[PDB]
Amino acid sequence: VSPKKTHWTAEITPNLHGSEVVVAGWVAHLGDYGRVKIVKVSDREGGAAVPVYLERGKTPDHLFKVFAELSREDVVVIKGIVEAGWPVALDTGVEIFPSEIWILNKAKPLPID
Amino acid sequence: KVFGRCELAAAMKRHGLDNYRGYSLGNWVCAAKFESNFNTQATNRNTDGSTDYGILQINSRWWCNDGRTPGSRNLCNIPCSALLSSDITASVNCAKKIVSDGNGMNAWVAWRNRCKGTDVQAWIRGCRL
């Protein structure tokens, strides 16, 4: 029951503020900082890496458990609301606050050691 | 130790945080105010089994090791207790690694909520730096 992609990551723009989007692509970057955790999604090579913010106090608890199973290069589908209210423009331009994170496949990454 | 505002501004400046990753000094004083109220001993356990430590409330899951958080990464390679010291060197070094991780100061929820996009220079006003 994972939702169909509605937008390409490069189509996530401030104009979409306040609307629901579904993005689909791979995990380009993960940052776990405690109360904030950010997963960036890409769907085009050398393309956008749109940041999906999970913030304690804002994001439902279960999605933090999903974030915990994530790895770089995992293929995901994430449903969320676009936020682009100032001061978002100071850096990222957009943020996505998720309501669903689906993991389609976990990457078989081979540790270097 | 509880720093005074200007006392912290001076220490943070000494430690090379002024414009570190493009963030002016006020951002860092503002972040400490709203994360720890300038208290280097500030310790806050989260419902998720992680704890936040020190003047900038650095988290035990990825950043420092506190011996009790599952899935520990200790990316700063320090024990969490080092972030509780009267001396802010360990917190500053670990903060500089965090702010370089790819999300800038958005790694700090207090900074996002209270500081980002505000007149952060107000936090160092009146100091003589």
Numbering used by the authors:
A (entry chain A): 1 to 113
B (entry chain D): 1 to 129
Which of the paper's sentences describe this entry?
In this study we have designed and tested the properties of a new protein scaffold based on the OB-fold of the aspartyl tRNA synthetase (AspRS) from the thermophile Pyrobaculum aerophilum. We term these small, single-domain engineered binding proteins OBodies. To demonstrate the amenability of this new scaffold to engineering for new binding specificity, we developed a series of OBodies with increasing affinity to a model target protein, hen egg-white lysozyme (HEL). Sharing a common range of epitopes centred on the HEL active site, these OBodies were also found to be efficient inhibitors of HEL activity.
In the third and final phase of affinity maturation, six residues in L4 of AM2EP06 were randomised and selections from this library resulted in the isolation of AM3L15 (KD = 30 nM) and AM3L09 (KD = 3 nM), constituting 8- and 83-fold improvements in affinity over AM2EP06, respectively. The crystal structures of the AM3L15-HEL and AM3L09-HEL complexes were solved at 1.86 Å and 2.57 Å, respectively. In AM3L15 (KD = 35 nM) L4 has adopted a helical character, with no similarity to L4 in AM2EP06. The N-terminus of the helix in L4 is capped by a tryptophan cis-prolyl peptide bond (W86, P87). In this case P87 appears to make hydrophobic contacts with HEL, while W86 mediates an inter-molecular hydrogen bond. Two L4 residues (D91 and T92), although not mutated in this library or previously directly involved in binding HEL were recruited for close involvement at the binding interface. In a position similar to Q87 in AM2EP06, the sidechain of T92 makes polar contacts with OBody interface residues of the β-sheet face, while neighbouring residue D91 introduces an inter-molecular salt bridge with HEL. These new contacts are the product of L4 rearrangement brought about by this affinity maturation step.
